[PDB]
Design an enzyme around this catalytic site. Structure first.
Site, mmCIF file in Angstrom:
data_model
loop_
_atom_site.group_PDB
_atom_site.id
_atom_site.type_symbol
_atom_site.label_atom_id
_atom_site.label_comp_id
_atom_site.label_asym_id
_atom_site.label_seq_id
_atom_site.Cartn_x
_atom_site.Cartn_y
_atom_site.Cartn_z
ATOM 1 N N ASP B 166 0.794 -3.905 0.157
ATOM 2 C CA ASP B 166 1.714 -3.465 -0.899
ATOM 3 C C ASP B 166 2.889 -4.296 -1.294
ATOM 4 O OD1 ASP B 166 2.187 -1.154 -2.288
ATOM 5 O OD2 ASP B 166 2.667 0.007 -0.437
ATOM 6 N N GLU B 409 -3.016 -0.128 8.897
ATOM 7 C CA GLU B 409 -4.150 0.202 8.032
ATOM 8 C C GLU B 409 -5.266 -0.833 8.109
ATOM 9 O OE1 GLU B 409 -2.626 1.162 4.156
ATOM 10 O OE2 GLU B 409 -1.735 3.038 4.810
ATOM 11 N N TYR B 464 -2.367 10.512 2.395
ATOM 12 C CA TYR B 464 -1.832 10.733 1.056
ATOM 13 C C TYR B 464 -2.739 11.601 0.190
ATOM 14 C CZ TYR B 464 1.255 6.883 2.375
ATOM 15 O OH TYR B 464 2.191 6.092 3.000
ATOM 16 N N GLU B 500 2.829 7.600 7.826
ATOM 17 C CA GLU B 500 2.987 7.497 6.381
ATOM 18 C C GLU B 500 2.532 8.767 5.661
ATOM 19 O OE1 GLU B 500 1.341 4.075 4.378
ATOM 20 O OE2 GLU B 500 2.312 2.600 5.662
#
Lengths: 588, 588
Positions: B166, B409, B464, B500
């Site tokens: 990101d 990740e 998410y 997260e």
């Protein structure tokens, strides 16, 4: 339009007996330059009707214009109309409206927020086509009822409209225009006064007919559709066994069907007019709707949306109301002018309480002595009262309307103020003895300094310590505010309502620290105010200022209008919205 | 820089015996074009040191540059230095750093987040002046430890840096540069392992000296200033009667004074190194700091501020920490790279718990099989481990650091993933047996699909649903999330932490309705996640993603970086901040 009186009819509706036609649409539009109403119109300029013109055009000259403007369009009277009396109505002109049928002046009307109409039946024929041209002047003066003065710019010579209020001076046909019909012998007015005997609900009525033909029937129907009482005569009272009362969170409305039967058992005119049945009493420090004490929650509001400015909007109305229910607001105040009539009927169905306010805002000069032969004199008071009449005549019937507000933030601490104001609340109680009377008091006019308040039933205070006086000093402000609350509660035995409290907030401006114009600061001020109200047992309500950001006169301390909105001008919740929702829904 | 080992010294400090000098300032700066380190520099271009260069210049070419850049400045060795051994250190180079003294290469270092230094004592003389030029290459490859590939643009031919993470690929000297001195016989490393016998606090130490001169003294001082135990030898353990324990909301730090006495009772080298005394155990589903169970609250964070990008900043650090205390956060995670060393010491004094993470982020391709001889192979694992070593070597001592995070990740559901990862947590437990080991698991790698998790001590999940899977369907998302929580709690007997969870939010975008990117939506997702955690007794903590908006690689679904921030990039609280403060301060 006569001194000491009010000549509007009832809100035009359609029936078995009357017919209704909308004149809304785009109209040809032009600015005062000569005598444009005597020939057709020469512009590619079209302006939508229900709307204020200023923002519509993206033109500076138009937005800035000082004086008269001209709306025009052709109209055809339906051939079905003859034997019916018909006429042309404006729900509101910007401020000063004039109606020309084909180039004869047919009406001239000085209020900016109340209807006016002209009977055109002997003037055009059923089946005929005429040129409707309507003239709207946006000019304020010391005598006009929002007061102001046009001035001229020394260098460029440009005309420029001064005034003492916040909100922008939007002009034009803000409210729907109509062409309707009524039978020769017709109902012109109806007066309804709702009261309660034990559990029996009695409404005193009064019907006014154009002539003395036939008689007057009245059916009174419930929400289900079944008539529950009847009556004859231009007046009496109607008894309702075990009444469903209109309640401030629980609207019940019966439908009063006034009819004008002719010599024989036949209906020649009829009119549907909804009432709900509720009393309103002030006992001492307490506000009673249906003999149970009541606490206002909500906002002063504005008629102000994006491009149409002040022009009434169906969908923003409904959305606005849903936001109120969303957050458990029960009331609002028609801020600094009477709103569209349809908002009042909606408020009735919606069970929202209304403080109905005349367009008397900025009766002061300290935002020079304001009450004299120069600024606010007797000709001004005359217009002020002229406006009180038309408001009441128009609004007397709405169960949602619950108290009249005579003025916003008048200079009520000054010599002259009492003489000026004395006849005004007295007029209101006289024309309508069912509701209490108030005005919203300015910060300057402290409990000590104010020489008007005793003439009024309810005390409405606008305060902004955490903003003006104690800038960002919330503790020093909590001091100031309770200082003041004490003063009023001690000096007077009325109930009190905060009609205005707030702080400009820019959506998305945040700060972990104490900082005005930050969503956070708005919350904090609002919150500490609440804490103070709860410690006064004399409080009868709280109205944040304001519902939503709105446009105002150009100004350095005005960030594109007023941002004291709890919602944005596009109706998005700032942090304050959620605080208010949390307080209003989670306790009583 | 050798395979299987780590050669940094201790964090340079000043003493009675060592001297310290800052090289921070503006340096001459230029881009790879040839061999610029052999003559002076030809630019009006100056770049501040502690800082990433990309944003600094307002130049597109510079920001976009792929390859090497050159920092340069003159340095003077103080004449007081001879008889002292001295050297030049970089706390971090962007990614790939090189040090030239006058135009001889003196150091070459591949980590992007850990120190490296060169002993220059035989190379320049005390009193002499040389030309320090430092080269920083920002190029990522499949073997570099944040992985990536440079490509070329078919039409324009421009060089372009791909990667899977990101956050933007900020390059340069992000962390302070130093010139310091040390006595010929000096302490090079210290190892501290704190434990507790009943109420007696014992710390096993280990001191490494350049030579075998004299002996090793150790005084251990409290916060007040009074030494409370002493010891001799390169190693032993120290007993502390009735220890003040370093606690996760209550930092206590003793000061371990390691000294190198010479033949006679005289000090020839000395070093002040703070420790606090705390144990960390995982028992089953439970995370124990000092034998009492612990629940993380806080954020993964970034080193990212306005113009300096990744460059460490004193005042943002302190401010950032105050915001944590403001909202009752107890921990955070060094997101996707080790942060400046000074942040770790601050965290210690501050009593904040840290999850310390290697710069292994984006070990996957699904944001093509990622574990093979093309993408992530054995040379990549080698660098991954090379980075694990330097992190631990550097950070082993901080009582705030409480668990190692091997990777972010990674593609841990794919064939190849297990072989790849197997030696890595094992390396970590070996080099440092005092702390547990983890990595933050991606959504794809479900409890079923993941083939790595069993090798780790704590389970760290990034999820998410309310964002990716159930877009705006919070209820359907509450389903998905508890589906998944169940799966993990059933399959494994570790404790779990949400490392997260979040949703992009634009400050000031509000909506009364369910709408992503609105301050309101962020609140709602966060809130329903919390509700779910509380119903799982296996949860050991929660870290929102992220602390603050941060810059990322250019992308259509990236509104000028990542807005999953709870605070803005300028550190202003969105609505979420206040929710988190309300949850973290009002319960346990």
């Amino acid at each position: 339009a006569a001194q000491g009186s009010a000549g509007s009819m009832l809100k035009p509706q359609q029936t078995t007996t009357r017919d209704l036609i909308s004149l809304d649409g785009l109209w040809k539009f032009a600015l005062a330059s000569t005598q444009p109403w005597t020939s057709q119109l020469k512009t590619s300029l079209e302006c939508p009707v229900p709307a204020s013109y200023n923002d519509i055009f993206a033109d500076s000259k138009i937005h800035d214009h000082v004086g008269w403007v001209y709306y025009q369009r052709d109209v055809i009277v339906p051939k079905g109309w003859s034997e019916e009396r018909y006429l042309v109505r404006c729900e509101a002109a910007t401020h000063h409206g004039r109606i020309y049928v084909n180039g004869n002046l047919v009406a001239d009307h000085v209020g900016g927020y109340t209807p006016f109409e002209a009977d055109i039946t002997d003037l055009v024929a059923a089946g005929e086509q005429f040129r409707l041209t309507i003239a709207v002047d946006n000019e304020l003066t010391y005598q006009t009822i929002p007061p102001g003065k046009v001035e001229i710019l020394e260098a460029t010579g440009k005309k420029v409209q001064t005034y003492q209020h916040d909100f922008y001076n939007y002009a034009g046909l803000a409210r729907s225009v109509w062409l309707y019909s009524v039978p020769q012998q017709h109902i012109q007015d109806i007066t309804v006064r709702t009261d309660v005997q034990g559990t029996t609900g009695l409404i005193d009525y009064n019907v006014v007919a154009s002539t003395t033909q036939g008689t007057i029937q009245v059916a009174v129907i419930d929400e289900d559709g079944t008539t529950v009482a009847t009556s004859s005569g231009s007046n009496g009272t109607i008894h309702i066994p075990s009444v469903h009362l209109w309640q401030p969170g629980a609207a019940y409305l019966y439908q009063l069907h006034a009819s004008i039967i002719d010599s024989s058992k036949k209906t020649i005119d009829t009119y549907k007019l909804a009432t709900g049945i509720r009393t309103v009493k002030v006992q001492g420090t307490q506000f009673l709707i249906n003999d149970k004490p009541f606490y206002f929650t909500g906002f002063g509001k504005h008629e102000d949306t994006n491009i149409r400015g002040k022009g009434h909007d169906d969908a923003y109305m409904v959305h606005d109301f849903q936001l109120l229910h969303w957050m458990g607001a029960n009331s609002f105040r028609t801020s600094h002018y009477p709103y569209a009539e349809e908002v009042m009927e909606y408020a009735d169905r919606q069970g929202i309480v209304v403080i109905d306010e005349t367009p008397a805002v900025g009766l002061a000069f300290s935002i020079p002595a304001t009450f004299s032969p120069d600024r606010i004199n007797n000709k001004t008071r005359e217009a002020h009262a002229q406006a009180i009449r038309e408001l009441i005549h128009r609004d007397k019937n709405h169960p949602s309307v619950v108290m009249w507000s005579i003025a916003n933030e008048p200079a009520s601490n000054e010599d002259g103020a009492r003489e000026y104001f004395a006849p005004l609340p007295k007029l209101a109680r006289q024309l309508d003895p069912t509701r209490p009377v108030t005005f919203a008091n300015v910060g300057l006019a402290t409990y000590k300094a104010d020489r008007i308040a005793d003439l009024f039933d309810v005390l409405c205070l606008n305060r902004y310590f955490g903003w003006y006086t104690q800038t960002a000093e919330l503790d020093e402000a909590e001091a100031a505010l309770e200082e003041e609350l004490r003063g009023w509660t001690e000096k007077y035995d009325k109930p009190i309502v905060m009609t205005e409290y707030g702080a400009d907030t820019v959506a998305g401006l945040h700060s972990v620290m104490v900082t005005p114009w930050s969503e956070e600061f708005q919350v904090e001020m609002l919150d500490m105010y609440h804490r103070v109200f709860d410690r006064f047992e004399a409080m009868a309500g709280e109205q944040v200022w304001n519902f939503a950001d709105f446009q105002t006169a150009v100004g350095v301390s005005r960030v594109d209008g007023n941002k004291k909105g709890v919602f944005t001008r596009d109706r998005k919740p700032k942090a304050a919205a959620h605080l208010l929702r949390k307080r209003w829904t989670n306790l009583h």
